[PDB]
Amino acid sequence: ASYHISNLLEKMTSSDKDFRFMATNDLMTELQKDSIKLDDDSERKVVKMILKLLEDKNGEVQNLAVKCLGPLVSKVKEYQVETIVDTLCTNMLSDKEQLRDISSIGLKTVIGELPAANVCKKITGRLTSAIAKQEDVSVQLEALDIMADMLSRQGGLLVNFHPSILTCLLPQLTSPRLAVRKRTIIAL
Amino acid sequence: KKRFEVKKWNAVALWAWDIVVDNCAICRNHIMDLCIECQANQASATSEECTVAWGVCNHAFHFHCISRWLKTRQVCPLDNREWEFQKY
Amino acid sequence: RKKLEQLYNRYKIQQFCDDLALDPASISVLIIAWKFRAATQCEFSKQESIEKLKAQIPKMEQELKEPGRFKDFYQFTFNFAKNPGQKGLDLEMAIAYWNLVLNGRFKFLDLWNKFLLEHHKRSIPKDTWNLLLDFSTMIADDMSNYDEEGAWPVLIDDFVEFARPQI
Ligand SMILES: [Zn+2]
Ligand SMILES: [Zn+2]
Ligand SMILES: [Zn+2]
């Protein structure tokens, strides 16, 4: 009911780790088993709460939120999926390494969960500029890994975006780092 | 009777706060010694687990003392921020 | 009403219980202490007929052995016989009180007493004492109804496992 969701959301900010871990586990196990009559405002609060918890200072809560992100996207309106993808993409470019790793893991989990078309198009549009020859080697590595995983999972779609992917991947073959060369070879 | 000379030396050292490494902040007993409540009772199964607990801020506290402190307060006593267990 | 209040004053050791030739190593002294809600041994204060005291023993011995009140007495014995400075009762003292209090009521008191001597050389916690009486009440001769995955302490189940082959 709405009361249970409200109390879980309220207790998710109890400043105590045990309370923060139990409520998130309850939310995850409720979403995993046929969540009933979740009003749009409840989706909004749940998405915002999970995104904020992804920045928590304890590893256990962040890991549980990352795992919960998967079953969440199974039943939500497409707009929340788009804004979650956008938030993960902009957090991937953050200077903090923990945020980059968390966003990459969340995006990989989302890609693995997804069997839907516009999400992949937006992700590819972001990664095309991400992989470009810039001064951040780690960002290039993460974007290459994400695109390789996305291509391995599904390749039937993105018919019109393949030339752009090839055009961005080709200059990476002469990068001084051999790991970049191997990763772009795998992506090709 | 021989002559030996050293060309180079490599050493590894560990750093910790000197205020609390010698003795716990909660209890003034030695860090390697048993806690205050583990000394009066010395014939129980809880006296064979009193070890050192470390955190992110490299603060060393007795496991029982920090567990009792984290029952009504959720901050590390010396740095005044959220405490997270790192090693035992 | 009168002349009874001065008994404590003149009292203020077997001489304390000369009304019935009682002995300190007996059930009745600790039963009376439980009736007087003494915190520990030989703990008396000013807050608390001779024929009435003499006749008290038959009746409240008869009444205490009934269930319910005996549960409260058994619970109070732990705090009465324990020093305030330690949460765990000593092994020898616990064995002595097991002999004194559970005389005959426990089916396997003699066998249970020989245990935790060459194996469990540690103090007894409060939870085992509380559940020992329930275990004795529920136990049977064959000991086939016991469960190893229940709500019993790790001492009771290991004692059951040790005593199972010998019967
Ligand atoms: Zn201790
Ligand atoms: Zn301590
Ligand atoms: Zn600290």
From Swiss-Prot, chain A:
Inducers of expression: Repressed by miR-148a.
UniProt subcellular location: Cytoplasm; Nucleus
N6-acetyllysine carried by residues: 52
Residue ranges of coiled coil: none
Spans of repeat HEAT: 1-36, 41-78, 80-115, 120-154, 160-188
Top-rank lineage group of the source organism: Eukaryota
Subunit record text: Interacts with TBP. Part of a complex that contains CUL1 and RBX1. Interacts with unneddylated cullins: interacts with CUL1, CUL2, CUL3, CUL4A, CUL4B and CUL5. Does not bind neddylated CUL1. Interaction with cullins is abolished in presence of COMMD1, which antagonizes with CAND1 for interacting with cullins. Interacts with ERCC6. Interacts with DCUN1D1, DCUN1D2, DCUN1D3, DCUN1D4 and DCUN1D5; these interactions are bridged by cullins and strongly inhibits the neddylation of cullins.
Described function: Key assembly factor of SCF (SKP1-CUL1-F-box protein) E3 ubiquitin ligase complexes that promotes the exchange of the substrate-recognition F-box subunit in SCF complexes, thereby playing a key role in the cellular repertoire of SCF complexes. Acts as a F-box protein exchange factor. The exchange activity of CAND1 is coupled with cycles of neddylation conjugation: in the deneddylated state, cullin-binding CAND1 binds CUL1-RBX1, increasing dissociation of the SCF complex and promoting exchange of the F-box protein. Probably plays a similar role in other cullin-RING E3 ubiquitin ligase complexes.
Family per record: Belongs to the CAND family.
UniProt-recorded name of the protein: Cullin-associated NEDD8-dissociated protein 1
Curated annotation (Swiss-Prot), chain B:
EC number: 2.3.2.27, 2.3.2.32
GO cellular component: a single term: Cul4A-RING E3 ubiquitin ligase complex
Subcellular location: Cytoplasm; Nucleus
Residues holding Zn(2+) 2: 35, 38, 50, 64
Family: Belongs to the RING-box family.
Domain notes from UniProt: The RING-type zinc finger domain is essential for ubiquitin ligase activity. It coordinates an additional third zinc ion.
Protein name, entry field: E3 ubiquitin-protein ligase RBX1
Organism: Homo sapiens
UniProtKB/Swiss-Prot annotation, chain C:
GO BP annotations listed: positive regulation of protein neddylation; protein neddylation; regulation of protein neddylation; regulation of protein ubiquitination
GO cellular component, one term: ubiquitin ligase complex
Effect upon mutating residue 127 to A: Loss of interaction with CUL1, CUL2, CUL3, CULA4, CULA5 CAND1 and RBX1. Does not affect both nucleus and cytoplasm localization. Reduces cullin neddylation. Loss of interaction with CUL1, CUL2, CUL3, CULA4 and CULA4
Post-translational note: Mono- and poly-ubiquitinated by ARIH2 and ARIH1. Monoubiquitination by ARIH2 is mediated by an interaction between autoubiquitinated ARIH2 and the UBA-like domain. The monoubiquitinated form preferentially interacts with non-neddylated cullins and modulates cullin RING ligase (CRL) complex composition and activity.
Function: Part of an E3 ubiquitin ligase complex for neddylation. Promotes neddylation of cullin components of E3 cullin-RING ubiquitin ligase complexes. Acts by binding to cullin-RBX1 complexes in the cytoplasm and promoting their nuclear translocation, enhancing recruitment of E2-NEDD8 (UBE2M-NEDD8) thioester to the complex, and optimizing the orientation of proteins in the complex to allow efficient transfer of NEDD8 from the E2 to the cullin substrates. Involved in the release of inhibitory effets of CAND1 on cullin-RING ligase E3 complex assembly and activity.
Protein name: DCN1-like protein 1
Name of the gene: DCUN1D1
Range covered out of full length: 62 to 251 of 259
